[PDB]
Structure 1
Amino acid sequence: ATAGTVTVNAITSDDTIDGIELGQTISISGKAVGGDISVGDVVKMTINNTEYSTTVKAGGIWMIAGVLGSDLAADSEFDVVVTSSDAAGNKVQSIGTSTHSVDLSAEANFSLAEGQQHVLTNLPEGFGFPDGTTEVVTNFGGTITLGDDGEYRYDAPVRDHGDAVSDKDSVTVTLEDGRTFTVNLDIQDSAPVAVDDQDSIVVQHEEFEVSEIAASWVSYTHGESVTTFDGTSDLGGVDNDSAKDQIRWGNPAESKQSGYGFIDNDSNLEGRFDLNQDISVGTFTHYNYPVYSGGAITSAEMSVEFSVLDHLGVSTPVTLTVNFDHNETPNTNDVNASRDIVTVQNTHVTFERDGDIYTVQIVGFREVGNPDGEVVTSIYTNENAATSYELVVRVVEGDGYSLPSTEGNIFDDNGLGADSLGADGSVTVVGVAVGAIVSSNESVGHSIEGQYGNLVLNSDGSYVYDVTASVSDIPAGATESFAYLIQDQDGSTSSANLSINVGTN
């Protein structure tokens, strides 16, 4: 008896029993050909301790109609034996061997937002918990719960998506029949949602009726040959009063004396001041000549006197004292170093009118004819030259301790709802900027300059905005817009705009 070749085809198409085939009946097949193998010969095989048999068909084909999937899952290797004979009664056995893989697992993949409950849909066919189990705890301590309604719900924990620890949760369910189901839960990050904010602030307009101004140099410290006088054509130019608007000093080292002159702004003011408005009370001229060392003042005081009229015709006199520190510097071959320096002090005076109080405050020096120019408190003048600047004051209601302001918190509901913080929390303001664009920057908790005023917005969302612009520079419908950026625990960010209506009345 000559043995043949016994072959076993793949056990299912992929040669592996999976979790669905586990519960099904599976046809096995193969061939038995060659040698003394003849049609009708017996084919036998033991699978998981059960014997299955059939016969060899024409062409050497053999098949087993139905083997239990559970048997093939329990026994991954088996022999097939074909019993044959030669013509002369002699027996022989042809043997083939089959191996297959067993993988009863199945995975379900989800990508779900943190801090929310989610119904798990499209689970793999046959998914379920072991009898009695209604909850499985995930690797992260979350849960998949089977509810009354037969739905499976996953409670996605909040995660720090910025750290070095993966945020892909997972759990494996094991059933008694050997199946496993691995649920992979990619936890997605949440973010805050900043919401635009609205605030408003009104600046008070009011016009005062004022007398002519009389400016007098009333005192000085140090200096030689110091004199004070009403201005003349040759020395300072003329004004409409007899107050002493010119001061001169020094022993001239080349030609004339150094000093100051102040020509009031009576004609331009036309007897009116406005409130909350940069106003020029006059033109200050610094005449810098070379004088011998030790002959110059170090400070001088000028009284700016004027009366304010109320609606009943009562005049209130007002004296703004203006202190100037003077530095007549040693002269070298360096022109810039040789410049003489005048510094005006930020003084003020408060007067009463019709039961309200108002404060006149020195703002400082402004280049002549440049009423939108930068205001400075120190001016520099070359030797052998004179510089001229408007002396700018502002009048405000009250004691002048603070400018018109409005405050708030961008986390509050300021007209369109409160910022949403997201599941991560730990939200703070990390950036603020004037305009429409902002990123995490170094302006939070700082004073930043807007179009009409300054903003201090802090990390906790609180802000103070104060108007610095003159009334005359605040157009109808004026508006500030500050973009701010908030950030949660693991870096998610959201921007919104704080819009401030800046009005006049």
Structure 2
Amino acid sequence: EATAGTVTVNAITSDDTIDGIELGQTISISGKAVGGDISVGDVVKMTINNTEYSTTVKAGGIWMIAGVLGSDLAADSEFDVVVTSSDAAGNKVQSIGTSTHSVDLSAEANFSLAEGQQHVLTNLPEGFGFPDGTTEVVTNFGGTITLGDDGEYRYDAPVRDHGDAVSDKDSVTVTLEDGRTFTVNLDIQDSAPVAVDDQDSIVVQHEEFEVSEIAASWVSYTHGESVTTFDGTSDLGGVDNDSAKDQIRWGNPAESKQSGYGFIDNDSNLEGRFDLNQDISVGTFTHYNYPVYSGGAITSAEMSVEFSVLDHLGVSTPVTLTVNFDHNETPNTNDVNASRDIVTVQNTHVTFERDGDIYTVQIVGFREVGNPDGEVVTSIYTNENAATSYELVVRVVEGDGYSLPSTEGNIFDDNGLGADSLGADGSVTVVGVAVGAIVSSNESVGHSIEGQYGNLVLNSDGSYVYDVTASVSDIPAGATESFAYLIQDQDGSTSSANLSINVGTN
């Protein structure tokens, strides 16, 4: 009985698997046959996909099959190799080896492509193609890969919500009749809007008025005991250049003197002229707070601020601004802040005509003396046994004074540099706005916000209104406002730009 040898088969190609390129090639198959009665020249046979391949054992037990079809090896993943040998006497024996290999005719093609655009697919894997008469495959997301006249493959990337819980990696597998598959993976990239800077301008009018001296008179009051009105004196209020009754006093003194108000006009500093669109002090208002017995104080008092405006024909127009004050002479306790007395001035106005145009004098409020740029308030607080003083600020404006100088627009329009680009996602709104150069999604859209020279209301649809609040005197040459705004698309992409407003005077 002859002695069988060892039959071995080497890996089928380097990685021991038949891929889609090897599918169309002729593949060498090799191995060994050693030991037992195996001799050089012995027959080597194997059946692969129902085709027999044969060779012989060479010196050293090497055996090799020149050319096996890749298609056969792709269709048959396991086969036996049989070697027929004999011994001296002629006793036969068969030595058998078995070979397995893997078959993977797939190839993948990976892309990362912007949404809402058509893209030519470059560097597709070798042998990529559509079967038969196919000119279009539909992707998992409903996109299409289309074979064009020019032989190029083009992908129409759908728009995606890149913020939701669904992957945006599209895919499609092409299958060919020979068994090859091609999987095209298409990572759809998000798009974003592009905000473009905007330009606007506004001009604030300057206009000098010639005005007479001011005469301020306390003309009426409600409640109070021992109420008197009088032209101011050195002892009570200080002196002014007229005989109008600029002082008012009330109350039964419970320690020393009467409480009241005094108003000393600004005739000398004004030098007989007003300016349009300019905070102006018409005089100094002093609140004299003394302790008076309960119930002896006014609750309101009215002061007429009278002056004439002269035109270029020499015609004088008399003007009377009525200023109403609400007064609270509060109960006095050991609490000094609670014991303070409170004056509130009302925001009244008066309109007058000069040279065929109307102008409106408006009460602004109280401002601390010596502080032209300080805060203006409408309520002031004075300790018992003290007096506080404030400039009484007005502003004169063209018209009926229903609105300040303003300009409007929409940041989505072309405002000098082109219209904002919205991106493929759409649903773009303004989600943040702020003065300066930095902006984030915030809670100022649709709100009035304070700039350098005015206020802005920018809404989510891009519409804005800017109005100048600053006094003309505080607007330097080349004054500019700039607000940064942030827009946001359907799935969260954001872009910022700046709304620049030129603020001039003329």
User: Structure 2 CA distance, aligned partners of 1:228 and 1:326?
Assistant: 16
Measure the CA separation in 2 of the matches of 1:254 and 1:36.
139
Aligned length: 505
Q: How many Å separate the matches in 2 of 1:310 and 1:398?
A: 17
Residue 372 of structure 1: CA displacement? Answer: 0.2
Matched residues in 2 for 1:400 and 1:460: separation? 28
Work out the percentage of aligned pairs sharing the same amino acid.
100
Deviations 1:104-163 (A, max 9, x none): 000000000000000000000000000100000000000000000000000000000000
2:496 corresponds to which residue?
495
**What are the superposed Cα offsets for residues 337-389 of structure 1, whole Å, 9 maximum, x if unpaired?**
00000000000000000000000000000000101000000000000000000
- Per-residue deviation at 1:442? 0.1
Secondary structure of the 1:36 match is: coil
Task: Report the 3-state secondary structure (helix = DSSP H, G, I; strand = E; otherwise coil) of the residue aligned with 2:298.
Answer: coil
The answer to whether structure 1 residue 275 and structure 2 residue 276 are counterparts is yes
CA distance in 2, matches of 1:428, 1:27: 65
Corresponding position of 2:26: 25
Q: By how many angstroms is 1:253 displaced?
A: 0.3
Task: Report SS of the residue matched to 1:298.
Answer: strand
- Report the CA distance between 1:453 and its aligned residue: 0.1
Per the alignment, residue 352 of structure 1 pairs with: 353
Q: Distance in 1 between the 2:90 and 2:72 partners? A: 35
Task: Report the 3-state secondary structure (helix = DSSP H, G, I; strand = E; otherwise coil) of the residue aligned with 2:389.
Answer: strand
Output the CA distance in 2 between the equivalents of 1:14 and 1:416.
60
Per the TM alignment, residue 289 of structure 1 is displaced from its structure 2 partner at its CA by 0.1
Report the RMSD for the aligned CA atoms in angstroms: 0.2
CA-to-aligned-CA distance 1:428-482 (integer Å, 9 cap, x gap) = 0000000000000000000000000000000000000000000000000000000
Q: Measure, in 2, the Cα distance between the counterparts of 1:119 and 1:171.
A: 16
Distance 1:352 1:137 in 2: 76
* Distance across 2 between alignment mates of 1:500 and 1:176: 67
TM-fit CA distance, 1:492: 0.1
For 2:333 and 2:178, how far apart are their aligned partners in 1? 102
Which ranges of 4 or more aligned residues in structure 1 deviate by more than 3 Å?
none
Q: Helix, strand or coil: the match of 2:424?
A: coil
Paired with 2:296 and 2:283, the residues of 1 have a C-alpha distance of 27
Cα shift at 1:56: 0.1
Residue in 1 that maps onto 2:424: 423
Paired with 1:308 and 1:371, the residues of 2 have a C-alpha distance of 24
By how many angstroms is 1:210 displaced?
0.1
CA distance in 2, matches of 1:89, 1:350: 136
CA distance, structure 2, for counterparts of residue 231 and residue 123 of structure 1 = 98
Cα offset for 1:218? Answer: 0.1
Q: Whole-Å Cα distance in 2 between the matches of residues 359 and 146 of structure 1? A: 74
Deviation at 1:278, TM superposition (A): 0.1
Residue in structure 2 matched with residue 437 of structure 1 by the alignment: 438
1:300-449 paired onto structure 2 within 5 Å = 300-449=301-450
Deviations 1:306-334 (A, max 9, x none): 00000000000000000000000000000
Cα separation, 2, equivalents of 1:146 and 1:427:
34
Q: Which residue pairs with 2:40 in the alignment? A: 39
Give the Cα separation in 2 of the matches to 1:29 and 1:480. Answer: 82
Q: TM-score, normalised by structure 1?
A: 1.00
CA–CA distance in 2 between the matches of 1:311 and 1:419? 50
How far residue 48 of structure 1 moved from its aligned partner, in angstroms, is: 0.1
Deviation at 1:239, TM superposition (A): 0.1
- Displacement of 1:410: 0.1
Alpha-carbon distance in 1 for matches of 2:295, 2:129: 101
For 1:399, what is the secondary structure of its paired residue?
coil
Cα distance in structure 1, aligned partners of 2:25 and 2:471? 88
Secondary structure (helix, strand or coil) at the match of 2:3 reads coil
Deviations 1:1-46 (A, max 9, x none): 0000000000000000000000000000000000000000000000
Once residues 462 and 425 of structure 2 are traced to their aligned partners in structure 1, the CA distance between those partners, rounded to angstroms, is: 17
Structure 2, unpaired ranges of 5+: none
* In structure 1, C-alpha distance between the alignment counterparts of 2:316 and 2:223, rounded to whole Å: 36
Q: How does 1:63-462 map to 2 (within 5 A)?
A: 63-462=64-463
- What is the rounded CA distance, in whole Å, between the counterparts of 2:173 and 2:407 in structure 1? 58
Per-residue deviation, residues 405-442 of structure 1 (Å, max 9, x unmatched): 00000000000000000000000000000000000000
Structure 2: distance between partners of 1:367 and 1:42: 117
Shift of 1:82: 0.1
Q: What is the DSSP-based 3-state SS (H/G/I as helix, E as strand, rest coil) of the residue aligned with 1:59?
A: helix
TM-aligned CA deviation for residue 192 of structure 1: 0.1
The TM-score, its normalising length taken from structure 2, stands at 1.00
Distance in structure 2 (CA, Å) of the matches to 1:236 and 1:28: 120
Q: Distance in 1 between the 2:314 and 2:146 partners?
A: 86
Instruction: Give unpaired runs (5+ residues) of structure 1.
Output: none
Q: How many Å separate the matches in 2 of 1:333 and 1:413?
A: 64
State the alpha-carbon separation in 2 of the partners of residues 184 and 178 from structure 1. Answer: 19
How far has the Cα of 1:178 moved from its partner?
0.2
Structure 1 residue 259: Cα displacement: 0.0
Local SS of the residue matching 2:433: strand
Distance in 1 between residues matched to 2:205 and 2:312, nearest whole Å: 18
Q: Structure 1, residues 260-313: CA drift from partner, whole Å, max 9, x if none? A: 000000000000100000000000000000000000000000000000000000
| In 2, Cα distance between equivalents of 1:402 and 1:157 | 49
Please state how far the C-alpha of 1:183 moved relative to its aligned partner. Answer: 0.1
How many angstroms apart in 2 are the aligned matches of 1:88 and 1:334?
133
Q: How much has 1:62 moved relative to structure 2?
A: 0.1
Shift of 1:500: 0.1
What is the Cα deviation at residue 503 of structure 1?
0.3
**In 2, distance between residues paired with 1:88 and 1:250?**
150
Cα deviation, 1:68-97, whole Å, max 9, x if unaligned, reads 000000000000000000000100000000
> For the residues of structure 2 that align with 1:167 and 1:423, how far apart are their CA atoms?
15
> Which deviations, in whole Å up to 9, do the C-alpha atoms of 1:213-257 show, x marking residues without a partner?
000000000000000000000000000000000000000000000
